[PDB]
Structures are given as C-alpha cells and as structure tokens.
Write a protein that binds this ligand. Structure first.
Ligand SMILES: O=C1CCC(=O)N(O)C/C=C/CCNC(=O)CCC(=O)N(O)CCCCCNC(=O)CCC(=O)N(O)CCCCCN1
Ligand SMILES: [Cl-]
Ligand SMILES: [Fe+3]
Length: 308
C-alpha cells in the first residue's frame, strides 16, 4: 500500500523530521500526553503530573480514565525534579512530544539524540491549547485527526456554554484577569498574560481581557509579577481568578491594599482550589476540558454574579 509522507516540524530549536508515523510515543512536560491519549494512543511513557494530584499517584483523573478505556497502562517517568533522560531512553520512543513545555536548548539537544522532538514554536510555556494539539498531533502523523480534535473540542466548549444559558450570559464580555495571589504574602502577585494558555482559555469561555493587561503584555514571559502598590492598575477587571482555598477571598478583602481592588472588593473573585484536578485543568488539554469545564463554569458564573 501507500506509505505516509515524511513529517517536517518547524519549532523554536529549528526543525524536526519524521519519516513515518511513530508507534512508540513518549511525552514530557504538561498535557502533551493527553493529546496523544485523546487521539487514541497510549504513550510508552510520560511525565508525572507535578500539580493537582499527590506525587504518589502522579496521574490526573481524566488522563487515567482515558488510559483504562484504551485498555492500556500508565507508564510514568520519575521526573518531578526534572527531565529523566535515562527513563526516556528505556522507553525506546520513536518521537518525544513537548509542544507544551519549558525545555531549554540543552534539553532539546539531549532529547533529540534519543528520538525526534516536537518542541514549542516560540518561548517556553507559551503554547495555547489549540496550538499544543496542532504541534503534538502533527508529530504523531495525525495532523488531520488533530484538526478534528480541535473542532470537536471547540464544539464541546460551545455546547457546555449552551447548557448553561444563565452562566453563559453572565460571564459573556466580562473583563477577567487570571492571577496568582497568595493571601499570606500580598506584597506582590502574578498576572498571567495572553501568551499563557490558562488566560487564553478564558476567552474561549466568552470572557475578555481588560485593556490594562496590555501594559504587562510582553515577549518575556507568560506571567508578570506586579507590586501591590500598583494594584490600582487592574481596577478595570470585572472578575479576578486565582488559586487558593476557602479563606482566600476574605483574607484579600481584609487586605489594606488588595481589598481596595474593585473585583476583590465586590467579591467577584473565582477561587480555584489549589492543587486539585480542577486547578490543574485551568491550562486546558482536550481531555481536561471535557472533564472539568462544567465545574469551571460554575465557579466563573458565581464570581461574575458579584461583578458590577
Ligand atoms: O510545571 C508546572 C506546575 C504547576 C504550575 O506552574 N502552575 O502555575 C499551576 C499553579 C501553580 C502552583 C504553586 N506553584 C508556584 O506557586 C509558583 C509560581 C508559579 O507556578 N507561577 O505560575 C508563577 C509565575 C512563575 C515562575 C516562572 N516559573 C516557571 O516559569 C515554571 C512554569 C510555570 O510556573 N508555568 O506556570 C507554566 C506551566 C505548565 C503548567 C503546569 N506545569
Ligand atoms: Cl444556567
Ligand atoms: Fe506556574
């Protein structure tokens, strides 16, 4: 029969060429294994999740669910402390997926000696969920199936919003900032920029970014650390999203500086329970979205009710 053409990947570290569809697939960093799994491929090895589950388990629920539905088993790399090059070698992969990753040039070179690497396009950790699918699925020789995975995922998002008309209308057009605010040390906090997939995902849910975000937008990173003394700059946000717990909101409202911020003052804050599957899903994968989007929308919806 007719064999597939060769695959040319243009990424941040140059170019990667595959001559056939890889049968043995390794993935690293975050989420890339879910792209392979959503395409019906069980990886010969992938990185332990360093967020959302105990280190003992190391695998997120939607990821584990798909694996068992494929009658496969989870082969985890012991790489919570950093890339485990030997473990990757032992898996004998034909390709290494890293479309969403923070690997360095040094990392890429070592990995490429093991197997062809699908790296990110621009800067570390600056890959949006659609682009993550595009990169990873192309490297698997499943570019066409990848475009259909994107289509079906976009459809799942849209249908879920349609299931909750009140929430959809409530959050539509609301100005949002995804942040990391620690109620313990409120002297400074993080704001994730539009280059970050967990911020971009919010625009898929119907929300928009305030114009103040542009000031913090840059080529540097996916997140910007700003002082609490500059908190007035984000008064144009209707709703603020941050990781935290059941004591976070009240602590922020009682903060002398942060408590003056409109969204915080109004209670228009979506607190995502830190180190839970829900929290981990905020940087979306095709598997995570289907698993958590309804719970996510309920938090966002409740926060946007307090928005003026
Ligand atoms: O390796 C990660 C772990 C979980 C993660 O970083 N998160 O942001 C999820 C919520 C984090 C929880 C508690 N962690 C830490 O608070 C520290 C600061 C932190 O993670 N931030 O996002 C703050 C801006 C970052 C510091 C730059 N650090 C890096 O560039 C690493 C990737 C980084 O910190 N990025 O956020 C890119 C993310 C790949 C998403 C998940 N992979
Ligand atoms: Cl509703
Ligand atoms: Fe982070």
């Amino acid at each position: 029969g007719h064999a597939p053409d060769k695959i040319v990947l243009d990424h941040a570290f140059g170019q990667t060429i595959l001559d056939k569809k890889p049968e043995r697939v390794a993935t690293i960093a975050w989420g890339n294994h879910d792209v392979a799994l959503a395409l019906g491929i069980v990886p010969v090895g992938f990185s332990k999740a360093n967020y959302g589950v105990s280190a003992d388990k190391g695998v997120l629920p939607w990821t584990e669910e798909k694996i068992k539905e494929l009658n496969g088993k989870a082969n985890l790399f012991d790489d919570l402390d950093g890339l485990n090059f030997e473990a990757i070698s032992n898996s004998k992969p034909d390709v290494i997926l890293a479309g969403y990753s923070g690997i360095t040039k040094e990392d890429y070179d070592t990995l490429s000696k093991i197997a062809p690497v699908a790296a990110y396009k621009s800067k570390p950790w600056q890959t949006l969920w659609r682009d993550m699918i595009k990169i990873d699925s192309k490297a698997l020789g499943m570019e066409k199936e990848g475009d259909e995975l994107i289509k079906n995922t976009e459809a799942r998002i849209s249908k879920e919003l349609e299931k909750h008309p009140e929430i959809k209308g409530k959050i539509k057009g609301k100005k949002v900032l995804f942040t990391m605010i620690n109620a313990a040390d409120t002297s400074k906090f993080w704001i994730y920029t539009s280059k970050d997939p967990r911020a971009n995902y919010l625009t898929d849910l119907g929300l928009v970014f305030p114009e103040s975000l542009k000031e913090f937008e840059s080529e540097d990173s996916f997140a910007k650390e700003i002082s609490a003394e500059e908190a007035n700059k984000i008064n144009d946000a209707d709703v603020i999203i941050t990781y935290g717990d059941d004591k976070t909101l009240e602590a922020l409202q009682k903060d002398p500086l942060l408590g003056k911020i409109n969204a915080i003052k109004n209670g228009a804050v979506a607190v995502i329970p830190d180190n839970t599957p829900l929290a981990a899903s905020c940087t979306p994968t095709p598997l995570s979205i289907n698993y958590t989007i309804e719970e996510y929308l309920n938090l966002l919806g409740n926060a946007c009710k307090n928005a003026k």
